[PDB]
Amino acid sequence: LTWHDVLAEEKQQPYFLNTLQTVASERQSGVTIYPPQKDVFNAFRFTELGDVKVVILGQDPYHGPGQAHGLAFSVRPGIAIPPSLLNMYKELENTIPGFTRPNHGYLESWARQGVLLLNTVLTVRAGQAHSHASLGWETFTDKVISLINQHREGVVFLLWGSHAQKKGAIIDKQRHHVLKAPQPSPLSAHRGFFGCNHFVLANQWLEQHGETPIDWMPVLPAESE
Numbered sequence: 001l002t003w004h005d006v007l008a009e010e011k012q013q014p015y016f017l018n019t020l021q022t023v024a025s026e027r028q029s030g031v032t033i034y035p036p037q038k039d040v041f042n043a044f045r046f047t048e049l050g051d052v053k054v055v056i057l058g059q060d061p062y063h064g065p066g067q068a069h070g071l072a073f074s075v076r077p078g079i080a081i082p083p084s085l086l087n088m089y090k091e092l093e094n095t096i097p098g099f100t101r102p103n104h105g106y107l108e109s110w111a112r113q114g115v116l117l118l119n120t121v122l123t124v125r126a127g128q129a130h131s132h133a134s135l136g137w138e139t140f141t142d143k144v145i146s147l148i149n150q151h152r153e154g155v156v157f158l159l160w161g162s163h164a165q166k167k168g169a170i171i172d173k174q175r176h177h178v179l180k181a182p183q184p185s186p187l188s189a190h191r192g193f194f195g196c197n198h199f200v201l202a203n204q205w206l207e208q209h210g211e212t213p214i215d216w217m218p219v220l221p222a223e224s225e
């Protein structure tokens, strides 16, 4: 069972197709949209439905050049680590044995391990946070989370902030493991994100069920000859 298996019908709904035409229109209208269209669904690309082990919801993609590449909280190599990801790294440094501050903010390696880095809104106009929040994306990501709840077993959900928490309220807390905390953004990180211990708790859960834990130290694609 793949994403395309469970979302094919959803992706033919007017609201959904319509969301994409509005983006494609905006891209040619004189404004820059992040991430590039080939990246918008990268969380799906890197983490197939059956490979989901951990779900980390973000809200809005980063809205600056070079930042957003289709994975919640991640930025491309060579880009400065944004404050929300820095705070994630801080919690990680304080809780995961051996963890040290990465020299990059690129989290593809998380995704390849089964961490679905899913923003609830998948596009944004450059420099304009939540600018596509009423496009239709939230309906789409509602359906995504619902499918995961239904079709998977024992996924760990890390729900950071009221929006993600609301979004994840439908999740079966008996079939899945839901962990709550404030967002890692600067405005709220020190209000409960620090000390939430979510990365360790995630791994303990996975280990309790015979799943291998996440290696949270993110790794840059290597150089070849």
Ligand SMILES: O=c1cc[nH]c(=O)[nH]1
Binding pocket: 057, 058, 059, 060, 061, 062, 071, 072, 073, 074, 084, 119
């Ligand atoms: O993609 C991102 C970046 C920042 N904050 C989010 O919720 N998601």
